[PDB]
Amino acid sequence: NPLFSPYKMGKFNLSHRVVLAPMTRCRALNNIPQAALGEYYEQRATAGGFLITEGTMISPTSAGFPHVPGIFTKEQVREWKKIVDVVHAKGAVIFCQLWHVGRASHEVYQPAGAAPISSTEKPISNRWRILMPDGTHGIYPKPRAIGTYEISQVVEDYRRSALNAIEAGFDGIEIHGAHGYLIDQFLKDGINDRTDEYGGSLANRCKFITQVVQAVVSAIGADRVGVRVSPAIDHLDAMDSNPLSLGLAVVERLNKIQLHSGSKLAYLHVTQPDYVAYGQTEAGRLGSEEEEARLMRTLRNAYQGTFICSGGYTRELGIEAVAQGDADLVSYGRLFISNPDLVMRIKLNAPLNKYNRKTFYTQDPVVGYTDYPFL
Amino acid sequence: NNPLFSPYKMGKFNLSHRVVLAPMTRCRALNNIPQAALGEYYEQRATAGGFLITEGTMISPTSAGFPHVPGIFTKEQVREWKKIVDVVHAKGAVIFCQLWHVGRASHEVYQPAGAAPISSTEKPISNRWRILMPDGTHGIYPKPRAIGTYEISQVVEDYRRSALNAIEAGFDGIEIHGAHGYLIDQFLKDGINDRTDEYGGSLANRCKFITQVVQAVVSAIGADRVGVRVSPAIDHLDAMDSNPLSLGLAVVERLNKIQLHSGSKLAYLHVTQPDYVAYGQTEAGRLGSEEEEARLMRTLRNAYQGTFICSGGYTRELGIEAVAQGDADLVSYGRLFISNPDLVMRIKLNAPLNKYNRKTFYTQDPVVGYTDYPFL
Numbered sequence: 001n002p003l004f005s006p007y008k009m010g011k012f013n014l015s016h017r018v019v020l021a022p023m024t025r026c027r028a029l030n031n032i033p034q035a036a037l038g039e040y041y042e043q044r045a046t047a048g049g050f051l052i053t054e055g056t057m058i059s060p061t062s063a064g065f066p067h068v069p070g071i072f073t074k075e076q077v078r079e080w081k082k083i084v085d086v087v088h089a090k091g092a093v094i095f096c097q098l099w100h101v102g103r104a105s106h107e108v109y110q111p112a113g114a115a116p117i118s119s120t121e122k123p124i125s126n127r128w129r130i131l132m133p134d135g136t137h138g139i140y141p142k143p144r145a146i147g148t149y150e151i152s153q154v155v156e157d158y159r160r161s162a163l164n165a166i167e168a169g170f171d172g173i174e175i176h177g178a179h180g181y182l183i184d185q186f187l188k189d190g191i192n193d194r195t196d197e198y199g200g201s202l203a204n205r206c207k208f209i210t211q212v213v214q215a216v217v218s219a220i221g222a223d224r225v226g227v228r229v230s231p232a233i234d235h236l237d238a239m240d241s242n243p244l245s246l247g248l249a250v251v252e253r254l255n256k257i258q259l260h261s262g263s264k265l266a267y268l269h270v271t272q273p274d275y276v277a278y279g280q281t282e283a284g285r286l287g288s289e290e291e292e293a294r295l296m297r298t299l300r301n302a303y304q305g306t307f308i309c310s311g312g313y314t315r316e317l318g319i320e321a322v323a324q325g326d327a328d329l330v331s332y333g334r335l336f337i338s339n340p341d342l343v344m345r346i347k348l349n350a351p352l353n354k355y356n357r358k359t360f361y362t363q364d365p366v367v368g369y370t371d372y373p374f375l
Numbered sequence: 376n377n378p379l380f381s382p383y384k385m386g387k388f389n390l391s392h393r394v395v396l397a398p399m400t401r402c403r404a405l406n407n408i409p410q411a412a413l414g415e416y417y418e419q420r421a422t423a424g425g426f427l428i429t430e431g432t433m434i435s436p437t438s439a440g441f442p443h444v445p446g447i448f449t450k451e452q453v454r455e456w457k458k459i460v461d462v463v464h465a466k467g468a469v470i471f472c473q474l475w476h477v478g479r480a481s482h483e484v485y486q487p488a489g490a491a492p493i494s495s496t497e498k499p500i501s502n503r504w505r506i507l508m509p510d511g512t513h514g515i516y517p518k519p520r521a522i523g524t525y526e527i528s529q530v531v532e533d534y535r536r537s538a539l540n541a542i543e544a545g546f547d548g549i550e551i552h553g554a555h556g557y558l559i560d561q562f563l564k565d566g567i568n569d570r571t572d573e574y575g576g577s578l579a580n581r582c583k584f585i586t587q588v589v590q591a592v593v594s595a596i597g598a599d600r601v602g603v604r605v606s607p608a609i610d611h612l613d614a615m616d617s618n619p620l621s622l623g624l625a626v627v628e629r630l631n632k633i634q635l636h637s638g639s640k641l642a643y644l645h646v647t648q649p650d651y652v653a654y655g656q657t658e659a660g661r662l663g664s665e666e667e668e669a670r671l672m673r674t675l676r677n678a679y680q681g682t683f684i685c686s687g688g689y690t691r692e693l694g695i696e697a698v699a700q701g702d703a704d705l706v707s708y709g710r711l712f713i714s715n716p717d718l719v720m721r722i723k724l725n726a727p728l729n730k731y732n733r734k735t736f737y738t739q740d741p742v743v744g745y746t747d748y749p750f751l
């Protein structure tokens with residue numbers, strides 16, 4: 001089983017290749033990490049296994065979900081420290097995902113009810129609804145388009161939060177640049193309508209994510225920085241006219257950063273739509289051999305370093321990914337929600353618990369969080 | 376006792392088990408003419424008292440968007456279909472012909488005089504989807520032509536004539552392919568139908584076309600020989616709707632009314648399940664979980680006065696639970712039936728199943744990947 005061959009992720013000697021994908025769960029009451037997060041990650045940690053935390057706030061304006069953790073205050077650092085200590089006592093490596101939602105927010109999640117910030121003034125269309133603190137779903141408002149200086153301050157918010165993660169004992173951080181959030185709002189040409197140095201060409205639309213990654217690489221080292229992107233996911237109206245083009249341009253920038261710095265990033269982490277059920281339709285699988293369909297392999301081939309694939313992977317699919325060189329590591333989201341011992345289950349090829357969408361974003365520290373049973 | 380093998384009275388048709396061959400385009404009907412290979416293919420899969428639904432069958436020269444799909448709009452096609460039906464009936468199976476117009480899901484290569492495909496709209500399917508071309512490449516859907524009410528009535532007439540033709544060929548009945556973004560679904564879904572006449576806008580307006588199609592075929596061959604297939608929640612070919620449950624319920628109410636007005640029940644309602652599963656997103660008109668998906672299916676079933684067939688990713692275990700819980704009366708299987716000619720028997724005995732080869736789903740070979748899948 002290739003999933004359980006060791007892999008050297010930069011400075012971290014992993015004993016297997018099953019990764020916990022980052023997953024917002026909203027148990028961090030008042031944006032402060034709670035003891036329950038420690039129990040949740042401890043359940044899923046394994047000796048030599050890699051974990052990536054739920055998206056974590058980098059500033060008071062970065063939230064778009066209720067009760068998600070921050071790491072921009074020293075109070076949060078102290079609470080994260082206790083969670084990190086418990087995961088490390090199980091021998092796992094854990095990275096903190098740094099998350100700014102950009103325009104995917106609401107006045108209720110913003111200080112003084114301010115407008116959320118983005119690359120643009122265009123709001124997410126009404127095709128999408130935001131989860132509200134009361135449990136209803138609200139409308140995405142009109143965001144404020146930020147100037148060059150505010151962009152530098154946001155970059156500094158990434159830098160300071162990476163430093164805060166190291167201060168909490170995290171082995172590294174992951175830059176959330178996927179799923180139509182702030183970084184994706186600069187990447188995707190379906191969103192970025194700027195005419196300044198951050199908009200227009202492929203090159204200009206990559207400047208934000210380049211500035212963010214370089215800032216954190218300089219602060220804590222390339223080998224403690226992972227970068228997550230989703231060029232082929234159109235979440236929250238974040239589609240690009242050429243996701244192949246955009247993926248390769250990101251890969252180029254990551255390679256140049258690694259070359260300029262003399263060291264490799266911890267990994268590139270690419271996540272894709274899950275098309276598991278498109279086989280049941282007449283035309284669902286037509287086009288599967290086009291280059292744009294082979295995007296995951298194209299980016300892997302162009303990238304120098306560790307590659308984590310994500311989106312719809314199973315035990316069988318993840319084994320195949322590693323053995324074919326499509327990826328070095330495979331991250332699992334939904335399966336890890338309901339299977340705390342997913343690593344053991346994948347190893348034994350044991351049955352897998354089903355997950356419950358209703359309890360993905362509730363505040364209960366136990367129900368739908370830590371009460372999914374072990375084998 | 377396996378509930379899949381308790382008998383079922385689907386109108387005047389007495390079935391021995393509830394495992395159904397789902398309708399499956401396979402492209403062996405060279406030049407749109409049923410060939411002997413279809414006879415062998417359907418015979419291999421027929422069982423005593425089993426129900427087979429054929430591949431989508433063209434109702435007119437404009438109705439095709441795959442190569443070498445059969446038609447049933449010529450008498451030559453009727454004659455060749457008759458030999459296939461006879462072979463299936465020889466084994467005691469019930470078989471319905473699925474009548475299928477692809478609408479905008481076509482290409483000039485498939486249309487008379489290279490004309491534009493017809494649809495409710497002039498909007499093409501997006502570049503997220505492809506068409507199978509005759510040479511086996513995957514191509515781009517072109518811009519369709521939106522038809523007026525008179526042309527709509529002529530399409531209705533095509534269905535009616537093709538339904539009469541199927542019964543003439545000996546088919547026990549027909550199925551209306553009103554699902555998966557094809558012509559009928561292009562009228563149903565408000566993600567496709569941007570019309571402003573009496574066929575567009577409101578739900579009732581958007582259900583006009585399928586109502587007239589079903590009523591025409593019902594009146595021509597009798598309601599108990601008509602099945603209706605829909606897919607209210609589906610990504611396929613951009614066929615999304617802002618409210619799939621309410622769209623589904625409105626179709627069900629029209630079917631219930633057609634039944635009450637004609638004094639008889641349709642053969643069945645056939646619903647396919649979504650081609651997706653959510654990942655914690657919140658999109659207008661997308662089902663958010665398998666639970667929301669399951670409730671949608673059962674809500675449609677409970678609202679419909681008659682037989683319910685469910686399809687889309689079913690296994691032996693999920694089919695048994697579906698019938699056991701009363702969520703469906705019959706379960707149609709597609710891909711597993713491609714690779715297991717004796718799928719029914721394998722499900723009865725809980726035997727291992729053959730893998731299937733997607734590569735030969737749509738080739739023209741009369742044997743390879745069609746009839747050479749082994750029996751138990």
Ligand SMILES: NC(=O)C1=CN([C@@H]2O[C@H](COP(=O)(O)OP(=O)(O)OC[C@H]3O[C@@H](n4cnc5c(N)ncnc54)[C@H](OP(=O)(O)O)[C@@H]3O)[C@@H](O)[C@H]2O)CCC1
Nearest residue numbers: 274275276278279280285288710711728729730731732733
């Ligand atoms: N004894 C067996 O192993 C049997 C397996 N069966 C099926 O026959 C096929 C056997 O071939 P395989 O063992 O080499 O697996 P493969 O076809 O290469 O793909 C495995 C899964 O990945 C799915 N999958 C494929 N391509 C894509 C894609 N682009 N995007 C997302 N998902 C995809 C695929 O769906 P479809 O095969 O397209 O219907 C399938 O569910 C499989 O589809 C398998 O599920 C029947 C029952 C018996």
Ligand SMILES: Cc1cc2nc3c(=O)[nH]c(=O)nc-3n(C[C@H](O)[C@H](O)[C@H](O)COP(=O)(O)O)c2cc1C
Nearest residue numbers: 021022023024055271311312332333334360654655
């Ligand atoms: C409840 C939930 C929360 C998620 N939160 C995040 C997140 O905070 N950051 C992120 O990059 N991806 C997030 N994702 C996406 C997952 O990390 C992962 O890419 C996706 O679920 C991959 O699908 P898989 O379940 O097939 O493994 C989340 C997914 C779910 C279902």
Ligand SMILES: Cc1cc2nc3c(=O)[nH]c(=O)nc-3n(C[C@H](O)[C@H](O)[C@H](O)COP(=O)(O)O)c2cc1C
Nearest residue numbers: 280397398399400431686687688689708709710736
């Ligand atoms: C190769 C192939 C061809 C199909 N052709 C048709 C068709 O012509 N008409 C239709 O309504 N559905 C068609 N379908 C969808 C199937 O009828 C059925 O709903 C689907 O296979 C889902 O069930 P499964 O998991 O058992 O394969 C087709 C599916 C496949 C895989």
